[PDB]
Amino acid sequence: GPHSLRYFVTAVSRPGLGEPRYMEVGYVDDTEFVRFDSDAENPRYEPRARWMEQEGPEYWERETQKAKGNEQSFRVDLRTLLGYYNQSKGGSHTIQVISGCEVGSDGRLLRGYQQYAYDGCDYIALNEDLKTWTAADMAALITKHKWEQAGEAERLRAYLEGTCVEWLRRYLKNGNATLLRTDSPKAHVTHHSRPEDKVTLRCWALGFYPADITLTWQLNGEELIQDMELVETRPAGDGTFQKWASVVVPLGKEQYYTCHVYHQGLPEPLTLRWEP
């Protein structure tokens, strides 16, 4: 299947408390693999996945220098945007960027992206053509115009089509035992009493990779998507994921409800019920 390289970047000002906090967190698919954090004791890019041990010192030096340069750019940006929006120096503000690319199973580019937010709202984004920008407001229109005059989209496109895909391919090769693995969900159902002669049934799916999964509850062959509570699929601390989904049903009738689990590591989807 397809694969992605994504960097989540955050710059947050702290007026009165020194320089902004600056972080870059890199993912291949759903797995964290590198990080830079300006608040660390000795700020440098660090491996976050075991297979990144395969890069030499020159990798960590270059990425570190690039991160430190980016940190300085974002510091400047925070001050620039205060001017664009006519805001005071006393308040904290946040810039966010998601930057990366996706390739097909053949390693060829499917999609590139670069999206910016300010204080949690859309600011500017590269369009899917990899040639033009969309600006969400008049401040971002200033940025768009600078980037047009500097040829920024062409520089960015060269990264997305070149560097980004080439490094993604390399990370997938080096990390193949981790990244191309499948860990099958293990499921179970729990049962909780309620007032009013009703009962919560909760279907759990544990230990799975990759993160994409579907959990449904059925009564008499029909999915109950409207009545279900669930959590977003969530990391479990060791590179796997988990999820649950619950439904509220009449006491005495729990035998008629079935949880269904669909995942890459389940040749046939799991069907299960509460086990008294």
């Binding site: 590198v34 991160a67 945007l81 920024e152 980004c164």
Partner: peptide
């Protein structure tokens, strides 16, 4: 792997 970002 990471891009060198432009100022805004």
């Amino acid at each position: 792997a990471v891009y060198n970002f432009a100022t805004m």
